[PDB]
Structures are given as C-alpha cells and as structure tokens.
From Swiss-Prot:
Organism placement in taxonomy: Eukaryota, Metazoa, Chordata, Craniata, Vertebrata
Span within the parent record: 867 to 1154 of 1154
Active-site residues annotated for this sequence: 130 (proton acceptor)
Role: Tyrosine kinase of the non-receptor type, involved in the IFN-alpha/beta/gamma signal pathway. Kinase partner for the interleukin (IL)-2 receptor as well as interleukin (IL)-10 receptor. Kinase partner for the type I interferon receptor IFNAR2. In response to interferon-binding to IFNAR1-IFNAR2 heterodimer, phosphorylates and activates its binding partner IFNAR2, creating docking sites for STAT proteins. Directly phosphorylates STAT proteins but also activates STAT signaling through the transactivation of other JAK kinases associated with signaling receptors.
Record-given protein name: Tyrosine-protein kinase JAK1
Species name: Homo sapiens (Human)
PTM per Swiss-Prot/TrEMBL: Autophosphorylated. Phosphorylated by TYK2 on tyrosine residues in response to type-I interferon signaling, leading to its activation. Phosphorylated on tyrosine residues in response to interferon gamma signaling. Dephosphorylation of Tyr-161 and Tyr-162 by PTPN2 negatively regulates cytokine-mediated signaling.
Gene that specifies this protein: JAK1
Residues that bear Phosphotyrosine: 161-162
UniProt-annotated binding residues for ATP: 15-23, 42
C-alpha cells in the first residue's frame, strides 16, 4: 500500500523544482492500462538522501486536513516520496487563473487553513522554513493544503529555535530578521513567512507584485552577495511590503503583527486563526 514500484510510476510532467529536489506528476499504473492513480513524486535532482528520508519521516508523522497527504515511498540506494496529487496546483498557479472567481472572503478562508496547518506543524515542534504561495496547494476552491516540507526541521529540544548550518539557497524574501541575521528559525519566523504568503494571496500571486519583485524595486538589484545585508537594513528601517489593493485595514493590521522586528512581539498562529475567523461572516 505504501510501497510504489519505480517501473510502474509513469512520468507525465514536472510539478516543481528546487536546487536539489524535484516534484513530478506520475500515474502509478501497475495494471498497464492507464487507469492508475495520479500521484506527486518527490525525488533528488541529478546526496542529500538523508534529508529526503527526514522529509518522508516528517510528512508520514503529519495528519491534518490542511497538510498534503503522504501516500508512501518508492525505492531505487535511492528513495522517492509519494504524495497525493492536487490537480489545481499551487496558489501561485491557481490564483492568477481564477482572479474573478476568488473574492476576499475565500482568500481569508485560505489564510485560516494555512494558519491551522502551520499551528498543527508547530504543535509537533517543527519549523517549516519555506512557507510561500508556491508551497500552498489548492485541493478545491474551498480548501488548501501545505504541500512541501523540504526545509522543515525539528526544533532543538528545550529550545525555541533550530539553527541552520547550511541555508545554501533559501527563500530570503520570505525570511524574518533573526533568520537573515543569525540563521535561527523560530515558530515566530514561520509567522513572518505567513504574513508574506498572505501578501502573495491578497495580490492573487501577481508576478509583478511578488515579494522578490517588490523588494527588488525597493532595495535595487545587487544579486547573490549583498542582497541579504540590503534586505536586513530595509527591514531595520521599518520598511514592509505595502497594503495590497482592496485589502481592508483589519486584514493589513493582522499582516503587520506577523512583521514585528522582534520574534517575541509577533502574533501566534492561534491568534491569527481567531483574528481571521472574526472577519468571516
Ligand atoms: C522541491 C520543489 C518545491 S516547489 O516546487 O517549490 N513546491 C512543490 C511542487 C508541489 N506542487 C506544485 C504540487 N502540485 C500538485 N500536487 C502536489 N502534491 C504534492 C505537491 C504537489 C509543491
């Protein structure tokens, strides 16, 4: 049930790619008649096998309505992670195609669902470290799920954070000051990334309004080396992503509470759930 044979995983197309990992759409077809189920397969790009094993162990341990469902594994010396496939794809793919169909009420319900999924992940003592719209999957127009855990780490025992020893290519434009200045990741650091994801969601994932595009227009291009320093300085000055068009004051105030410079001053996911639900009538 949880073991998928590689020869029967018929490649269809790519769903997404990282630096060292890729997610592909496959049809698991053991009958050879093309009636098999479509699944999302995460593997290693052409090791790092230990990190995919950790991700598998994390996802197998998560059971929640707003978290992509683990289905099993496929072995090669190598390993692949098998997950349910959500045909509507990420919010980055879905929102620009459905701008007219999705109103503020629906966006706020997605924000509650992501916070519920994140609060559940935090209760398991994990930090996601990669919360962005590209990682939020659309199950239906009424439901979303957190769909990738490639950077997820277990919080160091009796500590409030995880210290990254690598961070090779990480989503710096979604990162809190403590991640950028000290490589320390708190549950509060995910709260900051959430505020950035909420900003993406409210702009319908418009590429011109993306966190990278906006910050590249605020700071200016330098590439690779000085980007993080110039981002830290911009954040120290009190500059934040602006209020999206048609975002009400009440929603922006919640978003701004995700963006307090100090981790201890930020709102929690439980407070965000209650705050958004109070706006839903
Ligand atoms: C290492 C690559 C990270 S990434 O590319 O930034 N995001 C992931 C691609 C995936 N995604 C769009 C999916 N689309 C459809 N069904 C799905 N099930 C499970 C996943 C998934 C999330």
């Amino acid at each position: 049930p949880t073991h998928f044979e590689k020869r029967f995983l018929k490649r269809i197309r790519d769903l997404g790619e990282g630096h060292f990992g890729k997610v592909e759409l496959c049809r698991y077809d053991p009958e050879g008649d093309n009636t098999g189920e479509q699944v999302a397969v995460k593997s290693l790009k052409p090791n790092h096998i230990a990190d995919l094993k950790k991700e598998i162990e994390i996802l197998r341990n998560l059971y929640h309505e707003n978290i992509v469902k683990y289905k099993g594994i496929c072995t090669e010396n190598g390993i692949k992670l098998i997950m349910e496939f959500l045909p509507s794809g990420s919010l980055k793919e879905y929102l620009p195609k459905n701008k007219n169909k999705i109103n503020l009420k629906q966006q706020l319900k997605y924000a509650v669902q992501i916070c519920k999924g994140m609060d559940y992940l935090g209760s398991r003592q994990y930090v996601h470290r990669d919360l962005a719209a590209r990682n939020v999957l659309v199950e239906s127009e009424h439901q979303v799920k957190i769909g990738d855990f490639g950077l997820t780490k277990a919080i160091e025992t009796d500590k409030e954070y995880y210290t990254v020893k690598d961070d090779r290519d990480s989503p710096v434009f979604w990162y809190a000051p403590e991640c950028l200045m000290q490589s320390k990741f708190y549950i509060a650091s995910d709260v900051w990334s959430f505020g950035v994801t909420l900003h993406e969601l409210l702009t319908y994932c418009d590429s011109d309004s993306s966190p990278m595009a906006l910050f590249l227009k605020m700071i200016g291009p330098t590439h690779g080396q000085m980007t993080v320093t110039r981002l830290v300085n911009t954040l120290k000055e009190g500059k934040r992503l602006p209020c999206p068009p048609n975002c009400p004051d009440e929603v922006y105030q919640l978003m701004r509470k995700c963006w307090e410079f100090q981790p201890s001053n930020r709102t929690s996911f439980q407070n965000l759930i209650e705050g958004f639900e109070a706006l839903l009538k």
